[PDB]
Amino acid sequence: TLKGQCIAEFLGTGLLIFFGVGCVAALKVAGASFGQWEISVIWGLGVAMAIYLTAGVSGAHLNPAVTIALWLFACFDKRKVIPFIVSQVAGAFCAAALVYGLYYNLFFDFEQTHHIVRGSVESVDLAGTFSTYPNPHINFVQAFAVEMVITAILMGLILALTDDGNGVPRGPLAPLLIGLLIAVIGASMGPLTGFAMNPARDFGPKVFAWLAGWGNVAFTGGRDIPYFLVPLFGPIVGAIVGAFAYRKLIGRHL
Amino acid sequence: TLKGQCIAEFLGTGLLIFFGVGCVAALKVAGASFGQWEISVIWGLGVAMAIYLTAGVSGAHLNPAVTIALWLFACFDKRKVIPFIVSQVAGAFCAAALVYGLYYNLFFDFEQTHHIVRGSVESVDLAGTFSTYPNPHINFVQAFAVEMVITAILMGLILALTDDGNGVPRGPLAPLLIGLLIAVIGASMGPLTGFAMNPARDFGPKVFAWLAGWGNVAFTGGRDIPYFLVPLFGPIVGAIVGAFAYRKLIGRHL
Amino acid sequence: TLKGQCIAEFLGTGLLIFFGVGCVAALKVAGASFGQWEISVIWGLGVAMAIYLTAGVSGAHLNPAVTIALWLFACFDKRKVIPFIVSQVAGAFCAAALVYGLYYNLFFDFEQTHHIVRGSVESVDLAGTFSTYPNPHINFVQAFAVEMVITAILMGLILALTDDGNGVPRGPLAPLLIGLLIAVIGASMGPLTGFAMNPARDFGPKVFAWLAGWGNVAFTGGRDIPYFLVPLFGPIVGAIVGAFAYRKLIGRHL
Amino acid sequence: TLKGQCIAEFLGTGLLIFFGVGCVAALKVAGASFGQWEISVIWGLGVAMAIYLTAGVSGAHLNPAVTIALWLFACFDKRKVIPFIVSQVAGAFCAAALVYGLYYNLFFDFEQTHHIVRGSVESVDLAGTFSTYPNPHINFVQAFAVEMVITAILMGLILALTDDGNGVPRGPLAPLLIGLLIAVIGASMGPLTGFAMNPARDFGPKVFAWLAGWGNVAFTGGRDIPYFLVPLFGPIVGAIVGAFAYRKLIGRHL
Ligand SMILES: CCCCCCCCO[C@@H]1O[C@H](CO)[C@@H](O)[C@H](O)[C@H]1O
Ligand SMILES: CCCCCCCCO[C@@H]1O[C@H](CO)[C@@H](O)[C@H](O)[C@H]1O
Ligand SMILES: CCCCCCCCO[C@@H]1O[C@H](CO)[C@@H](O)[C@H](O)[C@H]1O
Ligand SMILES: CCCCCCCCO[C@@H]1O[C@H](CO)[C@@H](O)[C@H](O)[C@H]1O
Ligand SMILES: CCCCCCCCO[C@@H]1O[C@H](CO)[C@@H](O)[C@H](O)[C@H]1O
Ligand SMILES: CCCCCCCCO[C@@H]1O[C@H](CO)[C@@H](O)[C@H](O)[C@H]1O
Ligand SMILES: CCCCCCCCO[C@@H]1O[C@H](CO)[C@@H](O)[C@H](O)[C@H]1O
Ligand SMILES: CCCCCCCCO[C@@H]1O[C@H](CO)[C@@H](O)[C@H](O)[C@H]1O
Secondary structure (H helix, E strand, O other): OHHHHHHHHHHHHHHHHHHHHHHHHHHHOOOOOOOHHHHHHHHHHHHHHHHHHHOOOOOOOOOHHHHHHHHHHOOOOHHHHHHHHHHHHHHHHHHHHHHHHHHHHHHHHHHHHOOOOOOOHHHHHHHOOOOOOOOOOOOHHHHHHHHHHHHHHHHHHHHHHHOOOOOOOOHHHHHHHHHHHHHHHHHHOHHHHOOOOOHHHHHHHHHHHHHHHHOOHHHHOOOOOOOOHHHHHHHHHHHHHHHHHHHHHHHHHO | OHHHHHHHHHHHHHHHHHHHHHHHHHHHOOOOOOOHHHHHHHHHHHHHHHHHHHOOOOOOOOOHHHHHHHHHHOOOOHHHHHHHHHHHHHHHHHHHHHHHHHHHHHHHHHHHHOOOOOOOHHHHHHHOOOOOOOOOOOOHHHHHHHHHHHHHHHHHHHHHHHOOOOOOOOHHHHHHHHHHHHHHHHHHOHHHHOOOOOHHHHHHHHHHHHHHHHOOHHHHOOOOOOOOHHHHHHHHHHHHHHHHHHHHHHHHHO | OHHHHHHHHHHHHHHHHHHHHHHHHHHHOOOOOOOHHHHHHHHHHHHHHHHHHHOOOOOOOOOHHHHHHHHHHOOOOHHHHHHHHHHHHHHHHHHHHHHHHHHHHHHHHHHHHOOOOOOOHHHHHHHOOOOOOOOOOOOHHHHHHHHHHHHHHHHHHHHHHHOOOOOOOOHHHHHHHHHHHHHHHHHHOHHHHOOOOOHHHHHHHHHHHHHHHHOOHHHHOOOOOOOOHHHHHHHHHHHHHHHHHHHHHHHHHO | OHHHHHHHHHHHHHHHHHHHHHHHHHHHOOOOOOOHHHHHHHHHHHHHHHHHHHOOOOOOOOOHHHHHHHHHHOOOOHHHHHHHHHHHHHHHHHHHHHHHHHHHHHHHHHHHHOOOOOOOHHHHHHHOOOOOOOOOOOOHHHHHHHHHHHHHHHHHHHHHHHOOOOOOOOHHHHHHHHHHHHHHHHHHOHHHHOOOOOHHHHHHHHHHHHHHHHOOHHHHOOOOOOOOHHHHHHHHHHHHHHHHHHHHHHHHHO
């Protein structure tokens, strides 16, 4: 039942953002030690749990990019596409609000101590707690390339790990492996654009940060071209490229 | 046989606290490098082993919050509720004493070096070695919200990961996954209240620290409202909310 | 079909180098915190994913040393040996180029800041981002011994973990375990020669670095005897020693 | 065949020490970043691989304490006890020599730089690279208690994780879990005595260090009572206590 699937997607995406934004809030305003890998493995495993929670019901897309790609290449009911995407974005939204709710004090005490004006260009660093931003040394197009490539790999391997005709089936191991995959993508490519590769994972929380006092920079990142467009469309394009790539170069030869 | 189940719960909870309090003693008085994630993964995996050890006998609750919730929502024998809870709290108690026994010297040598008066408000930091305390920037109610929310998630996902009607069954993977789940909750929400979410895990060891020279602050944490009430009731309320939430929003649609 | 297997090997090796060279680029020019173990576990797990992706098609050698050894001891079609090796080296090549493409800016901005002349003896450190080099305290022969021994162990355990007549079969766990194995070899022996143990993993990326401005030092490492010979032949010799060792000391007694 | 089992034990124990002593050599003389947990997880997983390699043949004791305990409580052929123990100690010996062989230069260059006289009381720190020593704040008896307790837990859980009548059988997961168990014991109790809990793991390598220039301190640790007695007998006593404890408190109720 579509209502029960939307609920699952809502919770799954929210669970996913709870752990992800959470560990990043601990790093930013709680002063917890975290390396590029640890942050990546936490996000990865968080997504793994999200999957174990909802796969049996919704099928666990938990990513607009994944939903659009499954529709175009895995015969996913198009009537289910928008309902899913609205659930995904809504859960990420609420989850971000929940993480902020619990860390509320640390955000303010940190900004006061370090004289950070929320909403200013310098507050993008803490805004990073919720959504992704581009590394200082790269521009809009370079950043678009990154999200595109990595999401392609994400989609491609998600299919590979779930393709029962490819090598020994993984069974209950599938979700976990999808987690570690996300982990390594986040550790190898993360420093460039924050390995968003999920429109819902980035837009929802960005909208939240926008309401919470970060204003326009939550969307622009303090740049000329509004950055939110990259985590929005880059993942979608790449998820399609990846899904196509698998069916052509690997599936076709199974 | 109830006596054999209580023994299992006693050992399981103790095993769990052995690893948990242990890695935190190494961090505090042994000077070992540990980040927020490592401390979390150790606790998580420690609980995973505890489960593998006792699941076959007691069913591995190892948490008063989990026992009360299983009683109210999983048809758990109420006659078994109190015997279990007393075993859980007793094992955590003894385990804490055991960890202190082995680290005895490091505690004293550390307090002498850093001129720390055990029992004083400043000794709460080392008391943290055994039980949980609230982050400096939050109060009693904020802290209650945290334990409540997270334990709800703990219970909810524990059911999800063990619900054989939800997606592919995890089989022998269940305990491990429950461990990583605990890991990510500890890494995303830990800095706020020490991710207690287990009345026995906190009260028992607090009682121990109280006897060992930490006195009243072991319970108060050096605050106006006695802090031990949060890890005591917050987890119980949340475990019920979580258990309810799963049966309603997910189980109902399986 | 050999064409589909070469494609799989190309992608597998490239996937493997994407994650590996990637996390090392983040460490070198992105300033991400990574310890010897984290770098090792990322490489390890990256190789694990590579396997899950191609095992069903090519058989997932993803290593010239492994291919030559399977030919000589596992009855691998010799007609398939060279096609495989050219695919492996080509994927590692392209993958390295891809990682450089995405990190392009960080490389230049880093070299400008730290006044590093690409191609100079001092730039070998960043060249390390792609291929392996010998620790300052050891020479050509010592370095050859290291790659030789470790690859022997790599091959030996790869066979052990996939030998269904050895203990309980691992099933879908095999790849993952091969990953952790690679992880521990990288953490225990890594600081000596960068745990290359894969001719394709080192030569391809070295050739890339050579074209990208590192010139001759990409091959020499800034030493008297051209270093590329060690990751080239050392792994091959060892993979044979390891494969032999297993069949003799372990397989023979199963 | 007993000869093939001794060979397996020899290699298994050696594999185990290769990874363990190796990561500790990287930490000491290679300057690699490693926290208490990482060192522990590497040892743990190293032992996990050792098991996967030999379980099918020898049964993978790889520990004199485990062999004596299996004999007394798991009906292990006593004729096989000494042959096993001599193999275990011999492999650990050779493995240590192998790790020193590969890290040879780093040991000398480090000692010269930091003006460390091998064999002196101050060189025990580097000797620690091979075997275990007691934390500065504890004595012989305190140290004996630690090894005793922890090995008991090691044995107890090894039985629990392999006891097919206890909860769902772990199957191919058993070795890995035994690894993480070792990991958490090393992270929670490691700083006290180096979590030896394996006579062969400590005596063999100590004998090696003794020959390599560390002399008498390799055995004494620079203390009044020769320290090697603790990792020698403490583990054996505890392994028996643990094995007994499981059969009584858990097995009896299955
Ligand atoms: C779940 C519904 C959440 C709705 C958005 C709540 C955002 C609360 O966030 C608040 O936003 C204010 C407006 O910028 C700021 O002034 C406050 O500092 C900030 O705490
Ligand atoms: C499902 C997601 C659909 C996103 C549609 C585009 C939303 C763009 O959002 C807009 O961005 C502007 C530029 O910074 C801001 O000025 C506006 O306040 C904001 O509403
Ligand atoms: C398993 C039974 C354990 C009973 C509690 C033992 C506590 C030992 O702890 C001791 O407590 C004393 C009283 O405050 C302090 O003076 C000592 O410093 C402390 O070591
Ligand atoms: C199963 C757990 C039941 C706990 C019941 C409440 C125990 C409260 O404990 C009490 O807290 C007081 C306040 O700091 C102290 O003054 C007392 O010494 C202490 O006994
Ligand atoms: C996939 C095909 C890739 C072909 C090699 C591209 C290498 C681009 O690398 C470029 O090499 C130049 C020559 O040294 C240097 O001057 C530039 O700094 C460097 O960016
Ligand atoms: C499949 C891999 C085959 C490798 C064959 C040897 C390639 C050696 O490569 C050569 O190394 C020389 C020494 O630095 C350089 O001067 C040359 O430019 C380079 O082409
Ligand atoms: C596998 C057989 C190994 C036998 C032991 C080899 C030990 C080599 O070790 C050597 O020992 C010498 C004697 O103390 C020292 O002088 C050297 O510094 C040391 O390198
Ligand atoms: C299977 C292991 C049996 C160990 C038997 C005891 C070996 C003790 O070893 C001895 O220790 C002495 C004290 O430091 C040294 O003086 C001797 O050189 C050394 O041989």
